[PDB]
Structure 1
Amino acid sequence: IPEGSWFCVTCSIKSHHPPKHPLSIWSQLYDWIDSQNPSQYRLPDDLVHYFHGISRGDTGAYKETEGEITNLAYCGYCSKPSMGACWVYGCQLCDTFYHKNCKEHAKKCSHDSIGKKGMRVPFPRLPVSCLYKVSEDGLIKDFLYA
């Protein structure tokens, strides 16, 4: 722990310009990383809103909200995902699941073998929009190759 007036990484780059990196694929990524801050992991909001019911919370976790689209955990009673427990009534030939509380809707596909059915787990745009900076050496190696 240093005493006095502590400063974060943004308060660090607030006073002294850090050195930059050469030109490779990750240069700008490195700079962005060094610049901003530390903070926890946040899944993409495209991912948490994928399964029905579940959603983030205020500094929160997998929230198994009660189940009430074309590829989530479809149920044969009310078309609801399996809240809190992905175990449902299925067989080796079943197609749609049925909750353990919805076992009144246990189904059976049109199959030949009688399998074990139970609690289981399953626009044109501009052709020139900007100027590009290049490096002389990649250009030179490109030319020599061609």
Structure 2
Amino acid sequence: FCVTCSIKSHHPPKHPLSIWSQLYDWIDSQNPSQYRLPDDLVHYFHGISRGDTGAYKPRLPVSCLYKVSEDGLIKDFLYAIGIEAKKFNNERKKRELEVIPPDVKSALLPARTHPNLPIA
């Protein structure tokens, strides 16, 4: 062979029913599953020699339904709520001084004592 790129690769495999049932569950945490046994690896009228060569006789929509692991979803919500809860406690610290806004029924309103006082 003589090619300049030939940007591929080739290697001779054995029968692909164990290899392709793992590469599915690689990134997954759910262990692989099996199937009916006597259909898995038979001769199918092919008796093979030792050499194991050939035996002769643009946008897109949000469209799917996903199956997610309940472990990750739970562990994500605990981390998702932890950050949001700390952010709320961070802004819960309220220390402000004003005179004539009405803003909330908040924590620091001795303000209203000021504009009502000098007259009374």
In our comparison, the structure showing a higher alpha carbon Rg is 2
Richer in helix (by share): 2
TM range (shorter): under 0.3
Higher relative contact order (CA 8 A, sep 6+): 1
Richer in strand (by share): 1
TM-score, normalising length: structure 2: 0.24
TM-score, normalising length: structure 1: 0.20
